[PDB]
Nucleic acid binder design. Structure first.
Lengths: 46, 102, 63, 50
RNA sequence: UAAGGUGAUAUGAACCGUUAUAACCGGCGAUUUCCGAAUGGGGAAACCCAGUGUGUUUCGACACACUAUCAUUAACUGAAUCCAUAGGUUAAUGAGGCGAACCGGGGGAACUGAAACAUCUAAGUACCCCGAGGAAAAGAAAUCAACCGAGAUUCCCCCAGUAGCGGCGAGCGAACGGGGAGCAGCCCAGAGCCUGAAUCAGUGUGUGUGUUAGUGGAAGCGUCUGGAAAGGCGCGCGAUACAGGGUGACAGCCCCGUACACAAAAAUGCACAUGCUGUGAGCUCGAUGAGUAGGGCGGGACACGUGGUAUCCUGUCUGAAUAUGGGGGGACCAUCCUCCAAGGCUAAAUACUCCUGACUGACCGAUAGUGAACCAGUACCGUGAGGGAAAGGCGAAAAGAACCCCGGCGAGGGGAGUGAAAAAGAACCUGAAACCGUGUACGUACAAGCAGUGGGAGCACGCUUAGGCGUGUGACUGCGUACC
């Protein structure tokens, strides 16, 4: 019902977390295809 | 890096000012080589309000690049490429293909 | 003196010159107090000499 | 083998130009060979010798 | 080297500097705002605090130095236990950190061409996990045969789509026989005589010559037309240089490529000549590590998919003999052959083009090509896990509204104008499409039936010594159903 989009930090630890996107191999290919090979940036680290 | 040493006379010939003659130029990284400023009638800018607004209409930057006539002397504008021999120890100044060096 | 002209010296600027050379940035470099017709921005155009010691001391201590 | 080679009896008048073998060329001034390519007459048209 | 420069895409402004460190190229080395991959322990990525030392201080404190899990060998230390062992305190050293993909380990599908689906194919691919180097997996014969023989392996055309298995089904799919590619043998289980004699891991030296600076590097004028003549002609000269595209165009003629001569600090390619630390060479005499195999029943990949049965496997278990043979002879065993004692080692052939370097383009010339021209994996959707765009492009000189005039101290135009151009004017493409506004003349506020092509009056306009035509909505009405 309480739909939907919102920002927060503490909810990133099981889903949205940068060190977990490197810890999991499933994230690790994405991370390189998105910046190191993908010519780009993220920088949203806050 | 050009080995022809900035004291020297040139003209326009690769454009409609054909004949217009002058020396030393103004030379920096990527300069359009403006001869001696051989411009006609071309505006200047009026941003300032106070008593000094730039009343100018000539000699601002008007282009013809690198060099099309290898330093004039009498007539003729080749060879450019030719690189000579020793004169200064650490560098070499140049003239053209019948006159050794300056 | 671009540092390279003084290399003969028995000791390096950490001996206390490090502060005489840097006081200007916090005491004179404000609005017009270091100048208005003569100076402007000093630290790289001329005064770049001081940064150069910070490799050199590591360089020399090992030689 | 394969009568492919037989064109010189199709033309016979302007073409296979039976003359002399290749040694005659300069070569550092190959610009000159126009003067010497006159025995075959051809000057420059198709510069082979086979 | 040769002179200018301050990585920029508002360039305002300082300030180096054309003497040989102003930048900037290049060998090597040196740089720490805290995270750090990060590692004393903690983790909600950008840490917030333990430990113990150090040069020294206006004696507040300080910038700084170092530690961990393992694999492996020294030293000290130490249990419920004389002893054993296990476990800590150090000493040393390297890897744990990171790749798209190959390759070794196995896994690994669902449905779906079979016209039915619980065999198979599907499929050894999605991925996920683990290794460790640039090459690998391999490989030194219980190999293959007929008594002719061949030699790690197999590769490459075959023979052949032959043998050869099946819901008798769709798929899978050999080897021998011939030609070839090939074309060589050791070491322990260990003692002796011999003894820096053969190799290579390293680590310094000289050349033979790389890597790239530095060195370089070609021809012409006049004229009619002319914003640039770099077209045309003339040949006045040219050629192993007539790539391709730049310079405002179309330039053998200026180019920048080639073709060719000269040459580096200082590590360092690779080949050798060497030198310092370490290895093993020569020639005898010794030497022989079975739980290995067998079966009887399971699970098996094998050309053979359950079946009578075939190994070299694999797992509960059981359990010999040293080559005075039997392990096996792609049913079982002869006649008789071949590997060989079950430990370790081999030149060639294969693949990965990370990216960057040389040459070809009946290949991509933005309906595309490596997601890639970008600076677009970037922003317009994502509880998100991230799917990734609508998208090529002013153009001598930013030559980017000098100047004048009106209006809202505005928008836009009317002339000037850099200009070939504003039909290049910064809602930057030299440029029609769906639809529109004012108009030359039509038909016309009693309308029918894909709005017609006919057959024709004269009308806005145009040519004609007068000659029935060059022009379209379309008074009369005739003909109809244009589709697929």
């Amino acid at each position: 019902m309480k739909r939907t989009f919102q920002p927060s930090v503490l909810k990133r630890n099981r889903s949205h977390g940068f060190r977990a996107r490197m810890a999991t191999k499933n994230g690790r290919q994405v991370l390189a295809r998105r910046r190191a090979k993908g010519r780009a940036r993220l920088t949203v680290s806050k | 890096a050009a080995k022809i040493r900035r004291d020297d006379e040139v003209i326009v010939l690769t454009g409609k000012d054909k004949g217009k003659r002058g020396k030393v130029k103004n030379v920096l990284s990527s300069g359009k080589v403006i001869v001696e400023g051989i411009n006609l009638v071309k505006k200047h800018q009026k941003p300032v309000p106070a008593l000094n607004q730039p009343g100018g209409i000539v000699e601002k930057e008007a282009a013809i690049q690198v060099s099309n006539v290898a330093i004039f002397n009498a007539a003729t504008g080749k060879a450019d490429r030719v690189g000579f021999r020793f004169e200064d120890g650490k560098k070499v100044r140049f003239f053209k293909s019948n006159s050794e060096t300056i | 003196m671009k540092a390279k002209e003084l290399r003969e010296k028995s000791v390096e600027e950490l001996n206390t010159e490090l502060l005489n050379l840097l006081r200007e940035q916090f005491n004179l470099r404000m609005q017009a107090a270091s100048g208005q017709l003569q100076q402007s921005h000093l630290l790289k155009q001329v005064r770049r000499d001081v940064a150069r010691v910070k490799t050199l001391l590591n360089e020399k201590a090992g030689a | 083998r394969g009568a492919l080679k037989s064109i010189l009896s199709e033309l016979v008048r302007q073409d296979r130009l039976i003359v002399v073998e290749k040694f005659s060329v300069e070569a550092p001034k190959t610009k000159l060979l126009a003067q010497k390519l006159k025995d075959m007459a051809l000057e420059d048209v198709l510069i082979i010798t086979g």
